[PDB]
């Protein structure tokens, strides 16, 4: 069909939860020139455990990435999974 | 629906509920958004602890709204637990 398109005019700088979380994370740049957007920032949990009240890595809990299914352009529309940040999970549910 | 793909929403120390955001003039029509269940986080004894806060992790995502426009929208994907003491 006739598309008559018109042209119109880093997470570290937007949010610091990555550093303040009990399940902190680092942000890694995933580069791909054949994909739009070219750069995708992905969260990687710093520790296996979570940071407890005393400031130590506690292995009674785990840091886990929160992933979101997002559509990307490569043209072909593809579904990709990206880590947005980390949360802390425990084996006891209250 | 994220409940069928992942259950971290129920197992997290900063658990969350998923709310349906409906818009017929937007594609996708339905967007599931995370809402933190508590202000505090669940501690070692199973109680809501107010020495820490549950906070949403938001992601900037592009959405579609004869004429269409690509718009940037912010959505909560899940919650994390933050404390006022950084180690």
């Amino acid at each position: 069909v006739m598309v008559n398109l018109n042209i119109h005019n880093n997470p570290k700088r937007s949010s610091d939860y990555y550093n303040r979380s009990t399940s902190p994370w680092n942000l890694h740049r995933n580069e791909d020139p054949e994909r739009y957007p070219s750069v995708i920032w992905e969260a990687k949990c710093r520790h296996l455990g979570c940071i407890n009240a005393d400031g130590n890595v506690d292995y009674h809990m785990n840091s886990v990435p929160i992933q979101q299914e997002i559509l990307v352009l490569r043209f072909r529309l593809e579904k990709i999974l990206v880590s947005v940040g980390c949360t802390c999970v425990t084996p006891i549910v209250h | 629906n994220p409940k069928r793909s992942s259950d971290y929403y129920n197992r997290s120390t900063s658990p969350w509920n998923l709310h349906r955001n409906e818009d017929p003039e937007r594609y996708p029509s339905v967007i599931w958004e995370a809402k933190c269940r508590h202000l505090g986080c669940i501690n070692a004894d199973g109680n809501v602890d107010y020495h820490m806060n549950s906070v949403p992790i938001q992601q900037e995502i592009l959405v579609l709204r004869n004429s269409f426009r690509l718009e940037k929208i912010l959505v909560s994907v899940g919650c994390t637990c933050v404390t006022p003491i950084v180690h």
Partner: antibody
Amino acid sequence: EVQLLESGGGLVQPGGSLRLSCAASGFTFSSYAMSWVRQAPGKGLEWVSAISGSGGSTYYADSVKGRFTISRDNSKNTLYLQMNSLRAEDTAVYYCARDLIHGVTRNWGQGTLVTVSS
Amino acid sequence: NFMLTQPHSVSESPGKTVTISCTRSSGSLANYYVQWYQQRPGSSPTIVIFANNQRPSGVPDRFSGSIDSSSNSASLTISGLKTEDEADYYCQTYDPYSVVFGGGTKLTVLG
């Protein structure tokens, strides 16, 4: 360096309205809960209102419920306090404050003076 | 709701250790972090202590915070008291909805 710059203070008659602003810089604004605290001349500090980082949760002192509205614009790094139905007892210096978590304030602005008088 | 009670004024002599207490009327004090602010005349308050006992950079080692769950109170301790420590001191804490400041303590350095 954390900077919090309040504006909007002035003289208003009872029943009047005023909007205060607080422009923040030197930190990732959207990831911090914010609050307003006031101080009448020669008196103590009085908490007014608080708002979560996302703006999804708001909290108010009983003295200001139904009259004041706290809001924020995360794209502009600005905190607001819309003050309606003002009365003489609202006269004070209003301070913007950055909170590490709800109730833990780490930084204060310079304040803006609000005078409510006939 | 709850209240925080502080002494209206404290006078102490230089070089001594001064304690300013802050008693919570209702709710367990140990369930919520306590902050302490210093306010000099015509100035914005500055933080002295946050999260019960955290001292920010720039705050002298002479200032320390503590909590006593049995008495439901928090304390600000100033060791080696100096005349420059004269100011108003406020304690502050919260509950899941509200934030509350104590009435403030005027600290006078004698001699």
